[PDB]
Structures are given as C-alpha cells and as structure tokens.
Amino acid sequence: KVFGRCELAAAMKRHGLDNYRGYSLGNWVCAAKFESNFNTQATNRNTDGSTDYGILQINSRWWCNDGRTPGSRNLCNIPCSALLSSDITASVNCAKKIVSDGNGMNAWVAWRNRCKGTDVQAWIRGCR
Ligand SMILES: C[C@@H](O)CN1CCN(CC(=O)O)CCN(CC(=O)O)CCN(CC(=O)O)CC1
Ligand SMILES: C[C@@H](O)CN1CCN(CC(=O)O)CCN(CC(=O)O)CCN(CC(=O)O)CC1
Ligand SMILES: [Gd]
Numbered sequence: 001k002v003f004g005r006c007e008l009a010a011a012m013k014r015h016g017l018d019n020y021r022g023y024s025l026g027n028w029v030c031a032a033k034f035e036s037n038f039n040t041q042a043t044n045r046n047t048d049g050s051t052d053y054g055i056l057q058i059n060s061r062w063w064c065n066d067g068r069t070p071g072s073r074n075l076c077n078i079p080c081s082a083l084l085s086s087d088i089t090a091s092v093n094c095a096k097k098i099v100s101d102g103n104g105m106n107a108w109v110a111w112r113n114r115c116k117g118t119d120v121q122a123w124i125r126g127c128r
Contacts, residue, residue, distance in 0.1 A: 001086035003038040003055070005029060006127035008088075015092040021099050026120030027111065028095075032056060033123070034110035040091070041084050054083035054091045056108065063094055 003011070009029050012018070018025035035057040036042035044052045050061040050069045060069040064080035076094035083091050098107045105111045 001040045003032070003040070005033075005038070005123065008032055008038055008055070009124045009127045011088050012092065015089060017092060017095070020096060021104060023099065023105055024120060026123040027105055027115055028056075029123035030115035030118070030120050031105065031108045031111040034114045035108060040086055040088065043084070051080065053080045054085075055088055056091050056095050057110075058083050058091065058094050058098065063098065 009025055012028050013025055017023075017028045032038055032055045036055045038055065040055050042054065042057065044057060046052065046059065046061070048061065050059050050072065051066055052059050053064060053066070058064060058076070058080075060066040060072055060080050062073045063076045064078050064083060065072070065074040066080035076090070076097055078090050078094065083094065099105055101107070105116070
C-alpha cells in the first residue's frame with residue numbers, strides 16, 4: 001500500500017506514535033517518506049546481507065526473521081514479510097521497540113539526515 005501523508009499520519013496517531021518517546025508525529029511521517037516513500041512494500045538490501053522492510057525500513061539484522069540473515073536476531077518476534085502489510089500495526093509495534101533501545105530515531109538514517117533539526121510539523125500540516 002502507498003499511503004497518503006494525512007492517511008499515514010492518522011494511522012500512526014491511532015497506533016500511539018504521536019509523542020512516543022518524545023517524538024512528535026511529524027518526525028514519524030518524515031521518516032516514513034524518506035525511508036519508503038510511504039510504500040509498505042519497500043525492501044532494500046544492506047551490504048552485510050540484511051534487508052530493510054516496510055514503511056519504516058526495519059532491519060532483519062536485529063528486528064525480524066526473513067530466513068536469510070544468518071546469526072541475526074528477531075527482537076520484534078515477527079516474519080519480516082509482516083512488515084510489508086497494508087496494515088502498519090506490526091511496523092508501528094516494532095518501531096516502538098527500536099526507538100526505545102537507547103538510540104531514539106537516529107536508528108533511521110533518513111530521519112537523522114533529512115528530518116532531524118527541521119520543521120517536522122510541516123509533514124502533518126493540513127491533516128485533520
Ligand atoms: C498537492 C500537489 O502538490 C500534488 N502534486 C502536484 C504537483 N506538485 C506541485 C507542488 O508540490 O507544489 C509538483 C510536484 N511535486 C513536488 C512535491 O510535492 O515535492 C511532486 C509530486 N507530488 C507529491 C505530493 O505533493 O505529495 C504530487 C503532485
Ligand atoms: C512542492 C511542495 O511539496 C513543497 N514542499 C514544502 C511544502 N509541502 C507541501 C506538501 O507536501 O503538501 C509541505 C511539507 N512536505 C510534506 C510532504 O512533502 O509530504 C514536506 C517537505 N517537502 C518535501 C517534498 O515535497 O518532497 C518540501 C517541499
Ligand atoms: Gd512537500
């Protein structure tokens with residue numbers, strides 16, 4: 001599924017991302033835009049053999065099982081394919097674990113480089 005900006009903002013709000021560990025909703029919408037282009041089906045392979053999955057590009061190295069990242073962890077206890085779902089529940093629940101791990105949203109390279117220190121409110125401006 002390719003989300004609209006306000007559609008995704010509303011879904012992320014409903015699942016409790018707005019102000020989660022102090023990150024306003026616009027941070028999450030900005031991260032999703034540059035990580036996946038709001039596309040739940042986005043996959044990107046990393047040089048180490050791990051893959052990033054879904055709207056927030058969650059890494060199979062630590063967070064999910066794709067059966068092809070040897071000696072990887074599955075800390076969200078999900079098949080990586082569940083992160084490609086039109087329903088962002090799994091992605092959101094797993095993202096809550098990552099952002100909680102001490103590094104906050106710096107885990108998302110696109111957030112660090114393209115969202116951090118910007119007017120992130122702009123990403124939810126106009127949405128009901
Ligand atoms: C509502 C319109 O803005 C939709 N838009 C109309 C054309 N726009 C005009 C403009 O953006 O001022 C120029 C192209 N636009 C640049 C950009 O948005 O960054 C990219 C495509 N957009 C992406 C988006 O807007 O979500 C969809 C089409
Ligand atoms: C052409 C316009 O799109 C100009 N735009 C500024 C005004 N936009 C308007 C809008 O997106 O409706 C609001 C904020 N915008 C939300 C979004 O893009 O999803 C994020 C910043 N954008 C990133 C981009 O557009 O790729 C920078 C350029
Ligand atoms: Gd924009």
